[PDB]
Symmetry: D3
Subunit: 245 residues, 6 copies
């Protein structure tokens, strides 16, 4: 994978695939090029037997600053109305359509700035660990747009109703400890311990049977959407499907 993508790096060791957003000069802002490369990364890693767990993280200071505004407006304005359809679909494709129900377990390792559009893949990742020193913010409101793509849903799934509305409406920033207290991530630790803690967690997930872990994590995310009576059928079907596979 060395040198394979312009805007993303993948480094695999001991079954742990670190997927590293790599536009550090622009705080790993997600451009249309980054979106297309991330789809290719996820599809490729899915079928790579050396990858048992994915860890999503950022190069340099940022996790991701969110959408690349220049690069989106560059691409979008250079085409017909229908190019916007494609650009938005590419963003969704890696950020959650492939990632939320990904076949392998996924951990967001939030090393620094996590803003705006970054909240979609943050929550699509199964588990998340951040640095205390990381800063989070839904600044869209201060830029004059509401949260785009699945950002508001990412917050609804993880953070309480009052707290989500406060951060969305005010655009105020919050650090790692607060992110963990609100439920946006699993834990926050000093940046110096972030990689070690994340790796200990990844190792734990690697000890599980991947088909069973997949049934468990997909079953949980989907059951939130279903009634108890629906889930009787659905959750036993997931159990039987795991026994088959």
């Amino acid at each position: 994978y060395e040198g394979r993508w312009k805007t993303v790096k993948v480094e695999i060791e001991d079954g742990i695939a670190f997927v590293i957003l790599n536009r550090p000069e622009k705080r790993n802002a997600m451009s249309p090029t980054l979106n297309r490369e991330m789809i290719d990364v996820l599809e490729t890693l899915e079928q790579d037997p050396a990858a048992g767990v994915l860890v999503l993280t950022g190069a340099g200071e940022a996790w991701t600053a969110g959408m690349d505004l220049k690069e989106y407006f560059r691409e979008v304005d250079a085409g017909p109305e229908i190019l916007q359809e494609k650009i938005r679909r590419e963003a969704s494709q890696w950020q959650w359509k492939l990632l939320r129900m990904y076949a392998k377990p996924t951990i967001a390792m939030v090393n620094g700035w996590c803003f705006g559009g970054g909240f979609s893949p943050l929550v699509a990742c199964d588990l998340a660990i951040c640095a205390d020193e990381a800063t989070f913010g839904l600044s869209e409101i201060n830029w004059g747009i509401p949260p785009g793509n699945l950002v508001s849903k990412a917050m609804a799934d993880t953070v309480g109703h009052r707290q989500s509305l406060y951060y969305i409406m005010t655009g105020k920033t919050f650090g790692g400890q607060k992110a963990a207290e609100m439920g946006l991530v699993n834990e926050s630790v000093p940046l110096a311990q972030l990689r070690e803690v994340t790796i200990e967690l990844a190792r734990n997930l690697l000890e599980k049977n991947p088909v069973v872990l997949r049934a468990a994590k997909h079953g949980f995310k989907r059951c939130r959407e279903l009634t108890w009576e629906q889930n009787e059928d659905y959750l036993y079907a997931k159990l039987d499907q795991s026994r088959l596979l």
Copy 2:
């Protein structure tokens, strides 16, 4: 707005409209008259450009003691059966039908007693700050009625499952700090600073583009009800709708 309504007061100061429930002798219990006047207040303020943020509060020691089921069972019992349908519709109309998806940002400023039916507008308001000294309760059950109107849903949206069932089933009261801990409100502060803290927040909200703020807060409340694939469609529609309406 001086003297315009019997049971409510509106005072606007510098973009912030304080809407003050004003039956302090009855702890601001929500009578059919108050429900009709509150509809009129919300519809009026929606169209008044002087009002950029609405703060809902109570006169005197209460925020609101809940429904005036007294006056309710007065009008109902001495009227035709179908009168009840009108009274209940009027209650929902201001308490959440208009309020939950209100075009302007809203803050509940809970200065004291908040019981029973008051939970519906409390949660319909986008944000909420209460006094530590405030007392909350779903005392419904101790009077032999389950929570009426949208009260149980207001709890479901903001407070966890176990804690909601505890308060609904026991009817036990709790204070402002507990309300903040449970997630029913955003923050609890001493009554002496309640107004300052509320005004600070309202100023933050007043500075945002109102059409964009409306898209953000409505989109969030709605997206709770929809799957991620539904929301891809809905949230991008709200984003595009915001662009159109802002311009």
Copy 3:
């Protein structure tokens, strides 16, 4: 009369409080197909017993319940025809949540010790829960190479945050009573020495309520989480009116 009535469960009723005691303590009250059929009979019987006003579900010995008796499950399943599995899963759901979640009487889980795996379904079906600080919880399924079966994942979804649920489901790590309470899985964790007293105090409070009203309030809350505000205007007023009919 309940002495010696059931092999795997005991029922002891005093002062309106029916303690339902899972009783296979040598197998840490693992839930076998016999126990599931007995628990169906227990719940149907207690429903119509005028001496029982509130049910408290608890375990004999050190355990609350270690979960599905998978040995006894697979033993019979491997033995008999394919459809036997349908009956065993039906009987497990029947008591664990189909009867229990919307049970006509108030229910409290009193979690005295180990609560693993399949235990989580009745744990969350019970309206309220109090556990001992010493109790250990875990979703050990994943380490036994199966995902959570029956309604366990929904039980966690209803009561514990998205990240925390995924963490315990995916890792299979155990946690104690204080953590269960912090996470929202139960209402409160206290020392085992105080567990019965605290549970009885709560049960007494629930017994002071009109049962029909309590049933309306508790069912209404559980169901309202699934409905939109507009749907709930209809549904919750219908529960209010139904309560007023039934008395």
Copy 4:
């Protein structure tokens, strides 16, 4: 003489509510919307009205939204005015009407286009004239179905037929509206009133509160699973017993 744009003629418990801008094919202006809110709130509490029949003056039922009038009011003001105008349209067209306390019958005497679909389907039952023409012309005017039109189609007309009429904007007659399930029955115009009154009288026989429970219960049950409906529908049954 109470309303500019609507007439109400009550006769033997049957309240005919007549959209009355025949020069404009009873196009639904913001004025008409505001008056229709007052009509429904007023008739709800009028003991003399047992069933509502919604119909139109002149040749039309309704040609749908009055775009001229709408823009008129909308261009005269700030963005927030549009929020109010859209709320007023929904308030009578379905928010009050779909779950109205009394039974409602749409009596579709003629042209029914566009925005007219929402109150058409909000009314419990509908009888149209064979001679009546229906259409979702929105698409031919460069807008998608606004307000609740698409949902009104979804509730009553099959997936393929709905998408066909929405996408093409093709017109269809009364017999076709009945075949597709948009209305209950289509009859020649000469018999329309007589058939509608017979139905209305049948409805007037029933206990109003029981009928309300039945009507509302059905509409709502479509949205709920079987397990949810066990709870909800018995609650409606018990509420009906209480209210009489």
Copy 5:
């Protein structure tokens, strides 16, 4: 033998076809609390009976069922404790649709005559239905001052168009078998003289199929109506893999 096992129902198996015959012909097979309890036992028993591959539900005498036995129901509810109403409603739902709608074996309603009111719930819970042209249907509840109880309105929602459902629910008018088939309430209407033959042909067709596969298919279809396309991708492939595992 099932001969004389139940007071209000008979069961007879013809090489894999279990005919289940509501048997109170003097009452047009009105469904009493006893009948509900016996049907629960029947369905449970037949589920586990390897001699039974398809169930055919039909009525003794002239009727299929005239619906709820209101007289007997009111008798028992009036004389019993308040909570007896809960039990009775639970037992009616238990066989009518909770067990029957997602039954492990294929089910066919063979509607030989009168089908009113409450009989619509098990009519629609049965997978397929064939009726006699001479049969009469109605929801004449409304004429006796009762809206449709139990799952009647949902059974109509699932099978009959919106306008037609409302018409019959609101007017209480009867319709015959051919109109029942035209509206989608049943699959087919045939002269009563050919009813048993046509039903047997259908049942023996279903007996060709692998039972586990047929169960996956029919349950999958009924459930998928409640789910979005994206949810169904997950759900329907899980039912396919579950079918593979279990046969």
Copy 6:
């Protein structure tokens, strides 16, 4: 587009892109390769201004006989466990994930055999017109398979509850007139008139503003899933969004 793909052809005439499943010797059975090519086809045509409406049809006798189960099992048997995830994803990607909410109008022109897995793209297409002579079936069940992918939901969306269970449970076949009567397609005409009738419809759709038509048809499909109150919000948002992008 000549010769661009192995299993599919695309021929555009005056705004109408005919997308032709092209494995006639296997009655256009949908193999993993065909799935991948259809994804590329759909993504390509979405961005091609020359294509205003898509018509999905089959080469030879069949529309599609359904999933190529032989090829599917060969690949799943030989590949790693996780390959089954990918193959299933790719099937869904073109059959309905891209297709059901496609940016352009779509019409299924069902010229012949339509079985099993075929039902998903048939219903994902906005409209559908079939030949009277066409034969449809969910004969999965006779092979010991319940309907896979979205087939059961495609049925639920278009055909009534009873008729759907009947055909799913029995595996019996039905022809084009019956398909139209049940609501599975919009219309059935003799095969000799099928193309003409399809083209006339496609031309009508080409008259419309593409962005408005997209808002209309997407709004309809999505509104079936939402309550009236939810739809007040959603459908007005789709209206406003259309006026923006128009």
